[PDB]
């Protein structure tokens, strides 16, 4: 049936579906899992790496990348698209700071990255397929710590705790069970690591996971090797 | 050999342009019909006129247009395409007069529209407009001019032409008539045209359901003959025959 | 056979053959008879002008037209395409005349018309010009006769024929053609090669003949062509 | 039995199954003892890989168009039962026939014989063989110089 | 079916239309080329000399891209003209910018980048042309390359493209002196390969075109051998082969005597 | 029926023609690369040539800057185009900021160019995988790898070509500090890596080494022969 | 069909253009939105769905210039794009003329903008059903627009998944409109959303979203606890 | 004056089947003489030379542009350009840029390839072709050179009798010109010879 | 299907453009619209269908004002109707700005006809699937009415009808001495026409749109004032009863 309705982003199906958009959403699944948490003390991000074998340095599988001094970004999906949208995010944050001399709120930043992900095939901009990447922007704006999830179809929303990636449906349940509002960042780190361990194949061991935290204080902190060992 | 049919720029393996031929088929689809004949000092065009409703206004319904003061045209084909082509011809005539500073010979006006149609048949845009346009005018040196501008790129000059559904029978009758003393008078040419149309139609013409236009070496203006002239010619000439 | 690769013009075939240009050449061959002869001191072009009736004023659309007073052009194929190529050939000749103050050499005019055909045979929405041109010219002192094909290919000819029965025309010319054929006899040879292809009576008005010699290309008038036809018959 | 093209809609599934059964019988579970199989094909390119495998068709001989003096051998073989004059040079006939298959050689001899039959004569002469070569090896060539010059 | 568009990759990673053009080049004429310590030369097979055609163009397949380089073309005629014009334009653009006749390698790389763009961009079929470039450049002296439709170019001591080019190159391999061949020996070998590759076993000036590039007086010279020299070479070679045949017959007579 | 379009997703979520460009890269001759302490080396299979066919015109290693070298594997035309654009980018970043071009920076540039050609529907992806090896101005023997899909990574040693899988397994097995402990053990490692897939040895190996702040040099046939002889001596001694 | 529903450039051989009908269907996949008016007000109440009890709820009332609110049911992408275009039109009118743009004219501009991408093969129809509120000098409006590029001046309308319930409730209870009270009008909107609900579920301070415009009240949105005075007072 | 910026001088005359084109050698910017080996007569064929004069940058650029055009023309139309066609080509080259021109005055001298008859022409800085059977002078000291032209010429002139005449004329003209001189190159084109001389001059 | 009907740039192998014909078929499915030319004006009526009661009286308005003095009455797809109305508005504005006097209706019809012809010619854009009529009155030119259909034909009409019931509307319009009636009576007769063509059982609800432009208003096209509309509707109910008799 979907032989003439799902081969183009601009041909509606009888249901009213953008099947290329759902296919990009599926391509999100393939990626390595990420788990972002937002609590009263900041925002945490814990992601799984999929190191195939040594001789591939740690600093090429970029799941966490720093967005301004007050946001971190966890990627799930195609790397080229991830680079493009992270670059859009950085240039937007810095342009907003340049023009308004203030730190872009995470709502604004994820809104604008979504605004880029919107223009699939509009003849006023230049892509032709949805940016097949689902991103988590976890930052600290004037409303306290916040965490905003973006899906490839340009939809972004606040999330007090969200997991993305291959381990999406298998970790949303755990997050649902464990999360509670009055949570401290230490609890957030431990809980995210526990859920990652639950839904990974290799044994979590400080060189198959990345961790970062953006706090109402010290900037985005990427946990270093010794800190990884301590937490683990 | 029907697979080479869905684009105006793909040849058939036997070197035929099917969607150029289908433009002629559209001409025939026009439903109406037209004829034209040129005499020693006159040129006369006759054409159908269907008014299949009492509310249609005969003042507006007409297929004899005035491209410029001296050049007139009869259309045979879809009315919208015909009127677009008429507007184009008016534009080109005006531009010619503006640039080169003298009235466009019918030769060139028919050539120009033929070349527009040729551009459309070669570059795969537009959709070759389905009308056949027959131009009449007065040329100072050669004399009267009757030309036809088919929607594939021929702008050929005719002693007597026919367009539309009855084109074949009209051409046969006109050959038969021309083979006898081609030097025709004004009234004799008006006749030849009207008689050709009447016989190819197996009908007798009312003074209204036929549109006739004429140009002459003494009247170089596109005179659309009125009901009075049509009635007079029909009745008197058929009687005196 | 190679069936799929025949509806486009930007896609080769396993044989390496672009089917669409060959189809265009078939359209060309399915056209009017036209003949060309390179005399020792001139060139002669002729082409059947038969109409479908006596109605057509057989003086309104010619088929042997000039491009300069040393170069001329006749065709076999379609007619609108021919008018476009003649217009562009005149434009190229005049552009060359402005850039270099010298009448365009026939070889270069042929090359540029071939380049135009190439432009039109190389995009996904342009129909290759279905018409093959014989270009006659007098440059330096040596008459030139070239053929330009829809494929963008230009090539010299001692004498040729093109149209419905090019095979018969060319065998006849092969029999009757010798290098030192002065123009007055080349005209007879061309008219005879048109006779062996021309159904019905070759009246002086349904044949077009153009001769290109030192004096300059000239399309023979009805009186001259009638004289020649009577002499030949 | 030829290339196994896809089936279900427009594939020669039935002839393909015939080929598959032939494959299995030539080689397969409970194979053969002393049954030899010779196959012939005018062009193998499309012949299926399973058959041309060196398990079912072990050897693949080629029959190149008779070369020089092989054409002479064929001329002799198909001109022995004939009436040749003192001064017929079958070698010269061979050179005049380049790249001509053995069918062409037979046809050349036969057409020389028919030419002899024409003129109430029971003798074939060198010129008769030449005319036979001309009439047999008719190499039709396209006259469309444009289609021929497409390629430089 | 992975061959309906130039820019389409096949599941086994082959640009089909590119291979299609590469094999199509076979149907073109026959060009071969030989490098020799003294010079460089190309040979070309005039497929078509029907006696009603003419010889207006001294060269129908070999062109002079500039004073120091020549190129032989094989493939579609229209693409051939387009590519030769672009080659001339590149050469003179290089002269304008730098004021030194373009190194042959640079000229070939430029044209082959053009062909690469064509095979990689949008709706444009790959140029159905293969070219053999000969030339002299101050960096590496005499030089000979072959450029295919795919934009790939190889520097060949000797090579051949076109009909029976595989046989031509096999015989080149057999009879090429890898570092000692002179221009006359190169001409002899070219005639031999042409005789063995052309469909007709008999050669003549009506079917061959030979081009020779040599440095003399410090300046390059690109000469298209006239029919007189062509026929003299064809002769010399045919009579040499006839003498070889006479020697073979003498050997047969000796064997019979034994 | 979800192929043939460079900007079309398969219902499972794959872009197939970029993957096809990758599989086209798989059809190239082995190229290995290693970064030592102060020597970064790239080795390649020549795959030999007919004696008439020159070899200067068959290149697989190209220096994009005094401190960045590139080893190609894939299609030759795409190789040339990408290398040419890489060179212009190198000497354009030199003007953009008066600093030698970081190896990571030129790797990003190649990734950007490849993605630019992939993401649109009238651009055939560059089917080439490249190993970039260099010394950053600050001083570090960096090595990255770039795929046709416009993705780049920071490898310490890896190979692309016909035998990428086997040679990567071998390097996993036989790469250590001892290996990268001198200016010659790294070279020896790379020759050992090549010999697994390339057999003729003398006529099927080419090496190019870059020492810290030292211009890249392509080791001579004699020098590579001497090294293979030395590893052969060690092989027989330990056998 | 099966060969006439691949683009908006092809008519079917029975007088219907299929892509526009497909987009009309697309509008139904959003959430219930019930919009309505009185003699001085215009209220838009929309059902904000939840993607998880962690992730917050999708907003469905956006705030165009101070005299236009907008409730969107359809593609979020197209909703955002048309929201940006409406904001641009309002600001441009404010710049050239110093008068808030009439909401019977902003709608015309949107209709033209959405018809243009239903007659060219260069884009897809838009995919948001739009309820535009606002109080120009005349009176409060509730305009509806659907991807078909037809705009309706509705006494009170609704759109989205389970929008019939709302439309029937409007049929039944609209006789009261044009004389209700500042809060009673909102109550009627809430009842419409209640009927759109799937039962079991109710109007909770979260899933309820309310937007208000009118004389002496520029556009406002009541979310989180700003809505409690409505749900608490709502009849059980 | 723009011409006076870099001076220079070019001359050409024709005798009996022989032609001569003579140029001063100097490149001084303003008054600072920079070199004395600047090429101003360029070979565009076997027996066809162009003596571009005037501003230095424009002279060089017109030379490169015209060589570009002539190379293309010859290869594409295999032939040796006739002098009239070269004159028209230069006219087009200069007149393509009337609204801001190359500040040079080309002067073409040569022999017709076929009939071996002589040709000399000049052009203005916008491209009015200028052909005359006696003289062509361009560049600064135009008045002095015209005076020598008129007052030192006789018809039906042979190789050496034309050598002496063109030399003397340009020698005097350029000696009587500031911002010009310091060496005179004379190119004599004959039916089968071409001579490039570097005659004396008041290099001071 | 047919294989020659996709896109409007392809002649079917008879000389027919199935896309234009489908556009006309979509035209012949919308509510009826009548127009009649009098001696001193032209009157329009449209059989507006309230698809729901929620819609204010004053929903989709199928009688548009093009220029001060031309009325456009549209039947078909109303989005395309509004687009065509904007095209005609812009063309009237351009004519006034470029020439100085109010647009002649014959010219406006010709230009809009050529516009729709452009959109039937091309393969990247579908032909307008909505027919309409242009009517006006001027002291100089006089009352005029015109029809423009998808194919783009501007035949002049004394009276016309477009939509579901056009044959019935015609047949009933011939039952009128249009040549001599006046706007006041023709308004009531238009009401009668609409109410005789209307099908209550099929269209459920219904409302009436009317307008006239004539000398009686000085050429300023105006929606029929409320009182005249009410009186015409009363007479239409009475005429329906009389026909039922």
Tell me if D145 and C29 make a contact (CB, 8 A cut-off). no
Residues I4 and I27: their CA atoms lie apart, in Å, by 21
Domain ranges for chain A: 6-232
CA dist C232 and H29 (Å) reads: 77
Cα angle: F195, vertex F198, F201; to 5 degrees = 70
* Strand, helix or coil for residue I135: strand
Q: What's the rounded Cα separation, in Å, for the pair H87 and H82?
A: 9
Task: Note whether B touches F: 3 CB pairs or more under 8 A.
Answer: no
Would you list the domain boundaries of chain B? 1-240
Is C151 an 8 Å CB contact of chain E?
yes
Q: Concatenated DSSP letters for F141-174? A: EEEEEE-TTS-EEEBSEEEESTTHHHHHHHHHHT
Considering only the beta carbons, identify the residue of A27, A29, A55 that sits closest to F9.
A27
CB atoms under 10 Å from CB of G154, counted, come to: 24
Domain annotation covers residue I244? no
DSSP B236: I
Whether the Cβ atoms of residue B153 and residue B121 lie closer than 8 Å to each other: yes
Number of residues in chain G: 236
Structural Rg of chain I based on CA atoms: 18
Residue whose C-alpha is closest to residue A168's, from A26, A52, A71 = A26
Sheet holding F206-211, edge to edge: F157-160, F31-35, F39-44, F206-211, F217-218
What strand order describes the sheet that includes I144-148? I63-66, I70-76, I130-136, I144-148
Q: Which of I134, I221, I155 is nearest to I183 (CA)?
A: I221
Q: Which two tokens stand for residue I218?
A: 């000085």
The number of domains in chain I is 1
CATH number given to A6-232: 3.60.20.10
Q: What is the CA radius of gyration of chain C?
A: 18
Q: State both tokens at E104.
A: 């042959």
Give the domain CATH number at H5: 3.60.20.10
Instruction: Supply the CATH number for residue F45's domain.
Output: 3.60.20.10
Question: Determination technique for this PDB entry?
Answer: cryo-EM
- The DSSP symbol for G156 reads E
Per-residue three-class SS string for A183-201: CCHHHHHHHHHHHHHHCCC
Provide the H-helix boundaries in chain F.
16-25, 76-96, 103-118, 164-173, 185-197, 221-238
Chain A: give the shortest CA distance to residue G75, in Å: 9
- Which residue, H116, H94, H82, is CA-closest to C101? H82
Q: Does residue E210 lie in a domain region?
A: yes
Identify the residue whose tokens are 């012939």.
D40
Rounded to whole angstroms, the Cα distance separating E199 from D99 reads 10
Helix (H, G, I), strand (E, B) or coil at B203: coil
The 10 Å Cβ neighbour count of residue E254 is: 9
In angstroms, the CA C157 to CA C147 distance is 7
Question: Nearest by CB to H85, which of C98, C102, C111?
Answer: C102
The span from the CA of C20 to the CA of I41, in Å, is: 60
- Tell me the nearest-neighbour CA distance from E28 into chain H, angstroms: 23
Query: How many residues would you count in chain A?
Result: 232
**What is the spatial distance between Cα E184 and Cα F122, in angstroms, rounded to a whole number?**
50
Q: Are G36 and G164 in contact (CB under 8 A)?
A: no
What is the assigned CATH class of domain C3-232? alpha beta
Distances (CA, A) of B17 to A123, B9, G130: 34, 8, 49
CA-based nearest distance D152→chain C, Å: 9
HSE of F99, CA atoms in CB hemisphere, 13 A? 9
Cβ(B205)–Cβ(B171) below 8 Å? no
Tell me which residue of E187, E101, E114, E186 sits closest to E147, measured CA to CA: E114
SS3 content of chain B, % helix, strand, coil (to 5): 40, 20, 40
Give the nearest partner residue to C26 out of B13, B157, B178, using CB atoms.
Answer: B13
Q: Describe the crossing of helices E104-120 and E77-98 by its angle, rounded to 10 degrees.
A: 130
Residue E133 domain flag = yes
Residue A145 and residue A40 in contact, taking contact as beta carbons nearer than 8 Å? yes
Half-sphere exposure of A4 (CA within 13 A, CB side): 9
Minimum Cα–Cα distance from C109: chain H residue: H77
CB contact under 8 A, A160 and G23: no
Does domain B1-240 fall into CATH 3.30.1020.10?
no
Burial class of residue F183 (count of CB atoms within 10 Å of its CB; 0-12, 13-18, 19+): middle
| Resolution, Å (one decimal) | 3.3
Sequence-ordered strand ranges (E) for H48-182:
48-50, 107-111, 118-122, 130-131, 135-139
- In terms of CA atoms, which chain G residue is nearest residue I129? G15
Q: Which residues of D touch C150 (CB under 8 A)?
A: 146
Dist CA C68 CA C78 (whole Å): 23
Torsion sign, CA atoms I201, I203, I209, I210:
negative
CB within 8 Å of chain H, chain E residues 92-151: 92-93, 95-96, 99
Please report, for chain C, the start and end positions of each structural domain, with discontinuous segments joined by +.
Answer: 3-232
Question: Who among C101, C107, C108 is closest to H88 (CB)?
Answer: C101
CA distance B234 to G86: 67
Q: Flag whether E257 is in a domain.
A: no
Least CB–CB distance from B15: residue in C26, C57, C83: C26
Structural domain of I202 = 1-239
Number of domains in chain F: 1
Task: Please state whether beta strands F206-211 and C65-68 pair in parallel, antiparallel, or not at all (unpaired).
Answer: unpaired
* Neighbour-count burial of E100, counting CB atoms closer than 10 A to its CB (0-12 exposed, 13-18 middle, 19+ buried): exposed
Cβ within 8 Å of C, D 110-149: 143-147, 149
Which are the contacts of F9, defined by CB distance < 8 A and separation ≥ 6?
A20, A23, A24, A26, A27, A129, A132, F2, F15
CATH of region G2-235, choose from 3.40.50.2300, 3.40.50.740, 3.65.10.10, 3.60.20.10: 3.60.20.10
DSSP states along A150-191? E-TTS-EEEBSEEEESTTSHHHHHHHHHH--SS--HHHHHHH
Judged by CB atoms closer than 8 Å, whether chains meet at H89 and C100 is answered as yes
Residues 6+ apart with CB under 8 A from A54: F156, F172, F175
Distance of alpha carbon D133 from alpha carbon D95, whole angstroms: 11
D145, D147, D148, E1: CA torsion to nearest 10: 180
Q: What is the DSSP letter of A103?
A: P
Kindly compute the dihedral angle of the four CA atoms of residues I194, I200, I202, I207, in this order, to the nearest 10 degrees: 60
Q: Which of I221, I31, I66, I44 is nearest to I137 (CA)?
A: I221
Ordered by start, the domain boundaries in chain G are 2-235
């Amino acid at each position: 049936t979907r032989s003439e309705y799902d081969r183009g982003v601009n041909t509606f199906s009888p249901e009213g579906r953008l099947f290329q958009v759902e296919y990009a959403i599926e391509a999100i699944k393939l990626g390595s899992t990420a788990i972002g948490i937002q609590t009263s003390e900041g925002v945490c991000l814990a992601v799984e790496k999929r190191i195939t074998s040594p001789l591939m340095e740690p600093s090429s599988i970029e799941k966490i990348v720093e967005i301004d001094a007050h946001i971190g970004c966890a990627m799930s999906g195609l790397i080229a698209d991830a680079k493009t949208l992270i670059d859009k995010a950085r240039v937007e944050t810095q342009n907003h700071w340049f023009t308004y001399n203030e730190t872009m709120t995470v709502e604004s930043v994820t809104q604008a990255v979504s605004n880029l992900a919107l223009q699939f095939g509009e003849e006023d901009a230049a892509m032709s397929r949805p940016f097949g990447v689902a991103l988590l922007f976890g930052g600290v704006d004037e409303k306290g710590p916040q965490l905003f999830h973006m899906d490839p179809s340009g939809t972004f929303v606040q999330c007090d705790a969200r997991a993305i990636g291959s381990a999406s449906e298998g970790a949303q349940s755990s997050l649902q069970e464990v999360y509670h509002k009055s949570m401290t960042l230490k609890e957030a780190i431990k809980s995210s690591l526990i859920i990652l361990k639950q839904v990974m194949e290799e044994k979590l061991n400080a060189t198959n996971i990345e961790l970062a935290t953006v706090q109402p204080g010290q900037n985005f902190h990427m946990f270093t090797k010794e800190e990884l060992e301590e937490v683990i | 050999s029907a697979g080479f049919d869905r684009h105006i720029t793909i040849f058939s393996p036997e070197g035929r342009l099917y969607q150029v031929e289908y433009a002629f088929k559209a001409i025939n689809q026009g439903g109406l019909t037209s004829v034209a004949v040129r005499g020693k000092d006159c040129a006369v065009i006759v054409t159908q006129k269907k008014v299949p409703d009492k509310l249609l206004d005969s003042s507006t319904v007409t297929h004899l247009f005035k491209i410029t003061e001296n050049i007139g045209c009869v259309m045979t084909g879809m009315t919208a395409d015909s009127r677009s082509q008429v507007q184009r011809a008016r534009y080109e005539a005006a531009n010619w007069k503006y640039k080169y500073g003298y009235e466009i010979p019918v030769d060139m006006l028919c050539k120009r529209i033929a070349d527009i149609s040729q551009v459309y048949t070669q570059n795969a845009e537009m959709r070759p407009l389905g009308c056949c346009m027959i131009l009449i005018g007065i040329d100072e040196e050669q004399g009267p001019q009757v030309y036809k501008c088919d929607p594939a790129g021929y702008y050929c000059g005719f002693k007597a032409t026919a367009a539309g559904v009855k084109q074949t029978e009209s051409t046969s009758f006109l050959e038969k008539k021309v083979k006898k003393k081609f030097d025709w008078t004004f009234e004799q040419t008006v006749e030849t045209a009207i008689t050709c149309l009447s016989t190819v139609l197996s009908i007798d013409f009312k003074p209204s359901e036929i549109e006739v236009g004429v140009v002459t070496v003494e009247n170089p203006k596109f005179r659309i003959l009125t009901e009075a002239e049509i009635d007079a010619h029909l009745v008197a000439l058929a009687e005196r025959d | 056979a190679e069936r799929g690769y025949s509806f486009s013009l930007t896609t080769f075939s396993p044989s390496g053959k672009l089917v669409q240009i060959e189809y265009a050449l078939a359209a060309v061959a399915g056209g009017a008879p036209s003949v060309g002869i390179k005399a020792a001191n001139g060139v002669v072009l002729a082409t059947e002008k038969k109409q479908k009736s006596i109605l057509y004023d057989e003086r309104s659309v010619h088929k042997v037209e000039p491009i300069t007073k040393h170069i001329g052009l006749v065709y076999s194929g379609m007619g609108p395409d021919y008018r476009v190529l003649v217009h562009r050939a005149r434009k190229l000749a005049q552009q060359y005349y402005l850039v270099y103050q010298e009448p365009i050499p026939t070889a270069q005019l042929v090359q540029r018309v071939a380049s135009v055909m190439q432009e039109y045979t190389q995009s996904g929405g342009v129909r290759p010009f279905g018409v093959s041109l014989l270009i006659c010219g007098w440059n330096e002192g040596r008459p030139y006769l070239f053929q330009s094909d829809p494929s963008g290919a230009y090539f010299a000819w001692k004498a040729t024929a093109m149209g419905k029965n090019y095979v018969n025309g060319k065998t006849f010319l092969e029999k009757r053609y010798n290098e030192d054929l002065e123009l007055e006899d080349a005209i007879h040879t061309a008219i005879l090669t048109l006779k062996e292809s021309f159904e019905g009576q070759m009246t002086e008005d349904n044949i077009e003949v153009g001769i290109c010699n030192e004096a300059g290309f000239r399309r023979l008038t009805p009186t001259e062509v009638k004289d020649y036809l009577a002499a030949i018959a | 039995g030829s290339s196994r093209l896809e089936g279900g809609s427009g594939g020669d599934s039935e002839v393909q199954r015939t080929m598959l059964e032939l494959l299995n019988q030539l080689d397969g579970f409970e194979a053969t003892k002393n049954i030899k199989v010779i196959m012939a094909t005018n062009r193998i390119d499309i012949l299926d890989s399973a058959l041309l495998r060196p398990g079912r068709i072990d050897r693949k001989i080629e029959f190149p168009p008779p070369n020089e003096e092989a054409r002479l051998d064929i001329l002799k073989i198909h001109s022995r039962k004939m009436n040749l004059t003192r001064g017929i040079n079958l070698r010269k006939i061979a050179e005049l026939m380049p790249g001509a298959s053995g069918a062409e050689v037979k046809g050349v001899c036969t057409e020389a014989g028919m030419y002899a039959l024409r003129e109430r004569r029971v003798h074939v002469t060198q010129e008769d063989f030449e005319m036979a070569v001309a009439k047999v090896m008719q190499k039709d060539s396209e006259k469309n110089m444009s289609i021929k010059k497409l390629w430089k | 079916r992975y061959d309906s568009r130039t820019t389409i990759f096949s599941p086994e990673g082959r640009l089909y239309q590119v291979e299609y053009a590469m094999e199509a080049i076979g149907h073109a004429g026959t060009c071969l080329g030989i490098l020799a310590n003294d010079g460089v030369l190309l040979a070309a097979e005039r497929r078509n000399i029907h006696k009603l055609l003419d010889e207006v163009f001294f060269s129908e397949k070999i062109y002079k891209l500039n004073e120091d380089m020549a190129c032989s073309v094989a493939g579609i005629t229209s693409d051939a003209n387009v590519l030769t014009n672009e080659l001339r334009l590149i050469a003179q653009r290089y002269l304008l910018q730098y004021q030194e006749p373009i190194p042959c390698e640079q000229l070939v790389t430029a044209l082959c980048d053009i062909k690469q763009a064509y095979t990689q961009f949008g709706g444009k079929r790959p140029f159905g042309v293969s070219l053999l470039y000969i030339g002299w450049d101050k960096h590496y002296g005499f030089q000979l390359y072959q450029s295919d439709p795919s934009g790939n170019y190889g520097g060949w001591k000797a090579t051949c493209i076109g009909n029976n080019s595989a046989a031509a190159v096999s015989m080149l391999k057999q009879d090429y002196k890898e570092g000692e061949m002179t221009l006359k020996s190169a001409l002899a070998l070219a005639i031999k390969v042409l005789n063995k590759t052309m469909d007709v076993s008999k050669l003549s000036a009506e079917k061959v075109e030979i081009a020779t590039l040599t440095r003399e007086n410090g300046k390059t010279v690109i000469r298209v051998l006239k029919q007189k020299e062509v026929e003299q070479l064809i002769k010399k070679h045919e009579e040499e082969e006839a003498k070889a045949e006479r020697e073979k017959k003498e050997k047969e007579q000796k064997e019979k005597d034994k | 029926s979800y192929d043939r379009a460079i900007t079309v997703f398969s219902p499972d979520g794959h872009l197939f023609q970029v993957e096809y460009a990758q599989e086209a890269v798989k059809k190239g001759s082995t190229a290995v690369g290693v970064r030592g302490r102060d020597i970064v080396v790239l080795g390649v299979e020549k795959k030999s040539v007919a004696k008439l066919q020159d070899e200067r015109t068959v290149r697989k290693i190209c220096a994009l800057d005094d401190n960045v070298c590139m080893a190609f594997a894939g299609l030759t035309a795409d190789a040339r185009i990408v290398i040419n654009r890489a060179r212009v980018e190198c000497q354009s970043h030199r003007l953009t900021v008066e600093d030698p071009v970081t190896v990571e920076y030129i790797t990003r540039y190649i990734a950007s160019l490849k993605q630019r050609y992939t993401q649109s529907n009238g651009r055939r992806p560059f089917g080439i995988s490249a190993l970039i090896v260099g010394f950053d101005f600050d001083g570090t023997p960096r090595l990255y790898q770039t795929d046709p899909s416009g993705t780049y990574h920071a490898w310490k040693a890896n190979a692309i070509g016909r035998g990428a899988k086997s040679v990567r397994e071998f390097l996993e097995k036989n790469y250590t500090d001892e290996a990268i402990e001198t200016d010659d053990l790294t070279i020896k490692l790379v020759i050992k890596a090549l010999l697994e897939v390339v057999q003729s040895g003398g006529k099927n190996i080419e090496l190019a080494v870059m020492r810290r702040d030292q211009s890249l040099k392509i080791l001579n046939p004699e020098e590579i022969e001497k090294y293979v002889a030395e590893i052969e001596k060690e092989k027989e001694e330990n056998e | 069909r099966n060969q006439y529903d691949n683009d908006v450039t092809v008519w079917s051989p029975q007088g219907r253009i299929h892509q526009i009908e497909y987009a009309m269907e697309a509008v139904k996949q959003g959430s219930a939105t019930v919009g309505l008016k009185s003699k001085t007000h215009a209220v838009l109440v929309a059902l904000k769905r939840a993607q998880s009890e962690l992730a917050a709820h999708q907003k469905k009332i956006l705030h165009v210039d101070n005299h236009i609110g907008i409730s969107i049911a359809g593609l979020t992408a197209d909703a955002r794009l048309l929201c940006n275009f409406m904001r641009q039109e309002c600001l441009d009118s404010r710049f050239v003329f110093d008068r808030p743009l009439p909401v019977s004219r902003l709608v015309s501009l949107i209709g033209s903008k959405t018809q243009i991408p239903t007659q060219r093969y260069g884009r897809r129809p838009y995919g948001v059903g739009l309820l535009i509120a606002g109080y120009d000098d005349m009176g409060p409006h509730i305009f509806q627009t659907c991807p078909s590029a037809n705009y309706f001046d509705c006494r009170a309308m609704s759109i989205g998944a389970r929008s019939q319930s709302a439309r029937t409730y409007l049929e039944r209870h609209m006789s009261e409109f044009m004389e209700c009270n500042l809060n009673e009008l909102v109550k009627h909107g809430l009842r419409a959303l209640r009927e759109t609900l799937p039962a079991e579920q109710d109007l909770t301070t979260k899933n309820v979203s309310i937007g208000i415009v009118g004389k002496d009240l520029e556009f406002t949105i009541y979310d989180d606890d700003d809505v409690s005075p409505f749900l608490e007072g709502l009849e059980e | 004056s723009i011409m006076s910026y870099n001076g220079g001088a070019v001359m050409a005359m024709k005798g009996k089947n022989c032609v001569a084109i003579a140029a001063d050698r100097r490149f001084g910017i303003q008054a600072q003489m920079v070199t004395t080996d600047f090429q101003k007569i360029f070979p565009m064929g076997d027996r066809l030379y162009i003596g571009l004069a005037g501003l230095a940058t424009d002279v060089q650029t017109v030379a490169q542009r015209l060589k570009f055009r002539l190379n293309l023309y010859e290869l594409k139309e295999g032939r040796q350009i006739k002098p009239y066609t070269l004159m028209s080509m230069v006219a087009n080259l200069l007149y393509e840029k009337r609204f801001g021109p190359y500040y040079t005055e080309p002067v073409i001298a040569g022999l017709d390839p076929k009939t071996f008859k002589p040709f000399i022409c000049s052009l203005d800085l916008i491209g009015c072709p200028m052909v005359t059977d006696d003289f062509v002078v361009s560049g600064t000291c135009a008045e002095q050179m015209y005076g020598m032209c008129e007052s030192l010429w006789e018809p039906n002139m042979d190789p050496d009798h034309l050598f002496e005449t063109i030399s003397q004329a340009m020698l005097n003209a350029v000696d009587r010109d500031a911002v010009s001189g310091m060496g005179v190159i004379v190119h004599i084109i004959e039916k089968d010879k071409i001579t490039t001389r570097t005659l004396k001059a008041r290099m001071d | 299907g047919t294989g020659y009907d996709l896109s409007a740039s392809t002649f079917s192998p008879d000389g027919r453009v199935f896309q234009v014909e489908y556009a006309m078929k979509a035209v012949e499915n919308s509510s009826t619209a009548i127009g009649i030319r009098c001696k001193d004006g032209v009157v329009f009526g449209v059989e507006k269908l309230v698809l729901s009661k929620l819609y204010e009286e004053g929903s989709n308005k199928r009688l548009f004002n093009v220029d001060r003095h031309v009325g456009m009455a549209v039947a078909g797809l109303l989005a395309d109707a509004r687009s065509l109305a904007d095209i005609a508005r812009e063309e009237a504005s351009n004519f006034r700005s470029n020439f100085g006097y109010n647009i002649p209706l014959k010219h406006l019809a010709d230009r809009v006809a050529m516009y729709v012809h452009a959109y039937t010619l091309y393969s990247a854009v579908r032909p307008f699937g909505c027919s309409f009529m242009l009517g006006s009155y001027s002291v100089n030119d006089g009352a005029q009415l015109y029809m423009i259909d998808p194919s783009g034909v501007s035949y002049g009409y004394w009276g016309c009808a477009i939509g579901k019931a056009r044959q019935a509307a015609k047949t009933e319009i011939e039952k009128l001495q249009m040549k001599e009636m006046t706007c006041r009576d023709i308004v009531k007769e238009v009401a009668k026409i609409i109410y005789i063509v209307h099908d209550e059982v099929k269209d459920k609800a219904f409302e009436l749109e009317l307008s006239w432009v004539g000398e009686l208003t000085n050429g300023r096209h105006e929606i029929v004032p409320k009182d005249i509309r009410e009186e015409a509707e009363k007479y239409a109910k009475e005429s329906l009863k009389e026909e039922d008799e």
